[PDB]
Amino acid sequence: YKIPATGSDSLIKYETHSTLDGRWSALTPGPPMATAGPADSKFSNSQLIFAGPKQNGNTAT
Amino acid sequence: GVGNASGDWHCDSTWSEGHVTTTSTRTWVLPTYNNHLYKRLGESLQSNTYNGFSTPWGYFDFNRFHCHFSPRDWQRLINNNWGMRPKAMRVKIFNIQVKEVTTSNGETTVANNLTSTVQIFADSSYELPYVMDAGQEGSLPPFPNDVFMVPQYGYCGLVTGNTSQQQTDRNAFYCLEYFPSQMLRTGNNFEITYSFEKVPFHSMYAHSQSLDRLMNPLIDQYLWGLQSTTTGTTLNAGTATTNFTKLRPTNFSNFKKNWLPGPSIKQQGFSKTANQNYKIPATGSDSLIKYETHSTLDGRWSALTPGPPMATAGPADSKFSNSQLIFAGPKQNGNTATVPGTLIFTSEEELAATNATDTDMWGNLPGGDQSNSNLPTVDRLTALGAVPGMVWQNRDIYYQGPIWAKIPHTDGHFHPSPLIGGFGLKHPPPQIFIKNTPVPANPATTFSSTPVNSFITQYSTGQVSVQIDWEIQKERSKRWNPEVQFTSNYGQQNSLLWAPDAAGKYTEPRAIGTRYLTHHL
Amino acid sequence: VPGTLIFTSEEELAATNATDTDMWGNLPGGDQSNSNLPTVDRLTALGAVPGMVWQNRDIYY
Amino acid sequence: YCGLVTGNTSQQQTDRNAFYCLEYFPSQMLRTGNNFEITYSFEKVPFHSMYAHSQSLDRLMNPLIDQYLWGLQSTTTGTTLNAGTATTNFTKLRPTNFSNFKKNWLPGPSIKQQGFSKTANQN
Amino acid sequence: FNIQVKEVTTSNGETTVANNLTSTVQIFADSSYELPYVMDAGQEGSLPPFPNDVFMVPQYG
Amino acid sequence: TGQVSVQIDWEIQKERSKRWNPEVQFTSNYGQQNSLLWAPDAAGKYTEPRAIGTRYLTHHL
Amino acid sequence: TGQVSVQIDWEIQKERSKRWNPEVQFTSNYGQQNSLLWAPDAAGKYTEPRAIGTRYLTHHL
Amino acid sequence: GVGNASGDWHCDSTWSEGHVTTTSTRTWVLPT
Amino acid sequence: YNNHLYKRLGESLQSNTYNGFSTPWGYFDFNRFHCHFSPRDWQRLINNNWGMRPKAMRVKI
Ligand SMILES: [Mg+2]
Ligand SMILES: [Mg+2]
Ligand SMILES: [Mg+2]
C-alpha cells in the first residue's frame, strides 16, 4: 500500500510501535519471532537488514 | 515489679556508612474487643461479598515509613542515597498497665488492676492470615507524642462465587488462644527480634535517560530499515517503491533497539475538574467499578489499583487514575471529599523514562495484513504482558506509604514487588497479637456448666518500641550539574508545616517519594 | 455420553487464578470525558504483569 | 518420534530433519540369565502444592479496618448514568467496599477458553 | 497459676469487686485416692472444648 | 479466678494396612453453610455440631 | 517377556496447619456397591472409577 | 509476686512418630 | 516391532501434518502416578501432606 515516509500518515504509524511518554518507537527488531526466509518476497521489522556489498549510499529502492 | 519501669523511651535515628537505624517508641491503648468473643463475619454484596472472623485480639502494625522516620530523616535519606532496604527489626512492648473500669451513679472511675494480665504472641511461623500488608490503618502514628489505639484483628476467608457469603468446607477458622502466648502482668515486658531476607534495594532515583534514547545521537546505525512504500507525502498516492534507508540521526524513533518498555494495562483517566468527566454513579449496574480497569476473580470485580508500575500524570496535573496513590490531605478528617485539593495525590511520572503511560497504551499494531489494496486498521495495544526484552521500574515508596507486603503463598508469581509499593517478602515481619486476659466478674454460688459471660471491664495501655536497621547505598554519580533535592520550600507560614499547629494537632502536609536523585540507564 | 468419562476440575484455583471460560477482566476502550463514555473492552488474554501470582494445575492419581 | 514439520501442508522433510538410529548407541545384550538395572536422581524441583487455598486473593485484608488510601467513588450524584450533578466524589477506602481496596497482587495470566455444555442441545 | 482472689462488696446501688492480694486458695491432689472419685461419672465440669471459653470450677460432692 | 494448663502425652499407633482400595475418612462435608461449623457463630457462640468417633479406618480380623 | 521393577523415593511435606475446624479429606464414600470399587470385579477386570487430585487440605494465602 | 505473672498461656499439639502431645489452657472462676 | 525395521513416517494433513520414524525398539514408561501408588497410598499421601516431589528412582528389568 502506498505509505509516505513523513506526515500524519507516515510509515511509523502503520508499523507496530511502542509508545514511551507519547513518543513512538518502531518495534524493531522486536521480540524473537519466526520471520520470512531471507530470500522470500516479504519482510518485516523483525528482520535485521545490512547494506549489501555494493551499497555505499544511505538509501536504496 | 509494680513500682519499677520495665523499659525506657527511645526515639532516635543513628546514621552511619551504608546504614541507618531508626528507633520509635509510642504509647498504645488496648480495649477489650468483641467483648472477649470471636464473631463470624459475612455479608452478601455482589463483588463486595466477604466472610471471615473478628477476633477479640488486637495487633501491632509498624508497616508505614513515617512510623520510623521523622520528616527530616526521610529528607536525609532521599537526598543522598540511591537505594535502601530493611535489614533487621526489634520490637519491645513494656510498661504494661491494666486498668479496671467501674460505673456508678455519676461518672465512671478507672483503677489499676495489678494482678491482671495481657497475652502476647508473635505469629512467627505465619500460621495465621497476614493482614499487616493491606494498606490499612492501625500502624504507629507518625508523631512520637501521639497515643494510638491497638487495631482489632480480623481476617477474611475464602469467598466462593460472587453473590453469597456462605462458607464451604474449605473455609478455615483460626482460634488464637490455640497458640502459645506470653502472659504479662504490670512488671513484665515482651521482646522480639527479626531479620529481613535479602531483598533488592528500592531504587531512590529517577532516570535521567529515556529507554528509546540510549544511542549516540551523532552516529548512524549499520542497520537498515524500510522508510516508506511510496514517493511523496500523501497516503495512497505517489509511485509505489520500497524506499530503504540506513538508520541515522534525527530518525531515532526508527532506530533498531535492544529493549522495550515494561508491561502495562490501560487505566481510565478522570479529571480533577468535575464537569470534565462523564457522569458515573457510585452504585447500580453502571457504577464506577464497571468503567474502571478491573480484574475478575471468581466472578467478582476488583478494581485494578494501584496496578502494575506505570508512568502516571504529574501530582499537580488536572487528571489522575487508579494508578495513583491518594492520601488524605492535612485538613481532611472525614472519610469522603468532593474537593481534590483536600487530598494528596502521588505520582509515578518519573517512570515515563522506561514504563508505558497508565492512561495511554503500550503502543499500536496492525489490525491485519496490508497490500496494494488493503490498508489495515491501527489497533491499540491497551494491555500487554511480559515480552522478552522488556524492562521497567517499580513504583516509588512514600514517607506515609507501606514498607513491606507478604508475597502470596502460591506456586507462581511474576516480579513479586507489591503493587502499592515496598518490599515483597516471603517471610515478612511477624504479626504481634495482644489481648486483655478476661477476668470473670462475681460468679453464682451454684455450679453451672454454661460458659462465663460476665466479666470485669478492663483495658490496658503501655509502650511499644520498634527499631529497624536499614541498609542504604549512597549515590555515586559523576553528574556535573546540581541534582533535584527534596527541600522545605513552603515560604512564609502562619504555622510551621511538619509541626503541630497552635491547637497541638500534627498533620502531614505533603506526600514525599524517594526519587529526587537521578541515575542514567 | 459424557457420563462414561471422568472430568477433572481446577475449581480450587478460583482463589488466585482467573476463570478459563470467563476473562481476566475489563478495561476502557478509550478515554472518557463529559461527552464520551468509552466501551468496556474485555481482557480475554493477558500475559505476565508485575504483581501477578497463580497456582499451577493439580496432579492426578 | 516426530521430526521437524515445515509449513502447514506438506510432510516433506528438509535438510534440518534428523534421523536417529538406535543401534548406533551402545546397549547391553541380555540372555535369559541376565538382568538390567539403572539408578536416577531427580534435580531439585519445587514441591507440588497439595492444598486448595482457604483465602481469596482479593480478600487478604482485615475486614474490620479502613485503608489510609483514598480513591474516586463516583463522578456524579445519584444512581443513574449520564445523570445527576457532575462532582468528583472521593472516599477513604473502608469495609464493605473491598472490591475497590488498593491491592498488592493480581490474579495470574490467562487465556480465554471456549465453554461447552455436557448437554448436547445447549451447544 | 495466675491466681486472683476477688473481694465482693455490696452497696446501695450495684456491687463492686476488688483484688484481695493477701487472700489464699487451697489446692491439693488426692494422689493416694483416699477420697471418693467422681471425675469418671460422665458428668459436667470438665474444661470447655473451646480455648476461649471461661468455665466455672464444679463443686465437689 | 486463674488459669489452668493441662498437657497430655498420648501414644499412638499408625495404621499399617495392606488394603488396596481407599479407606473411609472423617471429612468435613457439610457443604454450603451460612456459618462455618466447628466455629463460633455470628454471635460468638461455639457449639459442637456432631459426635465424632474414632472408627473410620478398618482392620481385618 | 520379563519383569520390570521401578522404585521411587518421594519427599513429602506434612501439613502443619493451625486451622481449628476439620479439613476436607478424600474418602471412600460410594455407599452400597454390588462390586467394591477400586477392586477387580466379578470377571476380574480392574478399573479406576474416579479421578483423584491432591487438593483436599487447605492453606491460607 | 503481685505484679509478675506466675505462668504463660499454652494451647498447642505436637505430633511426632507414635506420639502426640496436647496442651490446653483455660481460665476458670471459683466461687465460694 | 516393524519386523526389525525403521520406517520413515509422514502424512500431509494440514494442521495434523507430521513426519518422523517408527523404530523397531520398544521403551519403558513409568510416567503416571498410579504406576507407583495404590489408591489407598494416594489417599495417605493427599490427606496428610501439603507437598510432594520425586527424589530418586531405580529401575530393574
Ligand atoms: Mg501511621
Ligand atoms: Mg498457599
Ligand atoms: Mg467439656
Numbering used by the authors:
A (entry chain A): 491 to 551
B (entry chain A): 214 to 734
C (entry chain A): 552 to 612
D (entry chain A): 368 to 490
E (entry chain A): 307 to 367
F (entry chain A), G (entry chain A): 674 to 734
H (entry chain A): 214 to 245
I (entry chain A): 246 to 306
What are the paper's exact sentences on this?
Adeno-associated virus (AAV) is an icosahedral, non-enveloped, single-stranded DNA virus which can infect humans. The AAV genome codes for three capsid proteins (VP1, VP2 and VP3). Next, the virus interacts with a protein surface receptor (AAVR for all serotypes except AAV4 clade members) to facilitate entry of the virus into an endosome. AAV5-like viruses interact exclusively with the polycystic kidney disease-like 1 (PKD1) domain of AAVR, while most other AAVs interact primarily with the PKD2 domain.
Here, a high-resolution cryo-electron microscopy structure (2.2 Å) of AAV serotype 4 (AAV4) is presented. In the current work, we focus on AAV4 since it is a serotype that is not dependent on AAVR for successful cellular transduction. Again, AAV4 does not appear to interact with AAVR. The prepared AAV4 VLP was imaged by electron cryo-microscopy (cryo-EM) and the reconstruction was refined to 2.21 Å resolution, according to the gold-standard FSC curve cutoff. Refinement against the 2.2 Å resolution cryo-EM reconstruction brings appreciable improvement over the crystal structure at 3.2 Å resolution. The all-atom r.m.s.d. is 0.80 Å, 0.72 Å with flipping of pseudo-symmetric side chains and 0.48 Å for backbone only. As discussed in the following sections, VR-IV is key in blocking interactions of AAV4 with AAVR PKD2 and VR-VII is key in blocking interactions with PKD1, with the updated coordinates clarifying the extent of steric conflict. The VR-IV loop in the AAV4 clade has a conformation that is different from other clades; furthermore, residues Thr446–Asn449 in AAV4 are incompatible with the binding of PKD2. VR-VII differs in the AAV4 clade, with a fold in the native structure that would overlap with bound PKD1.
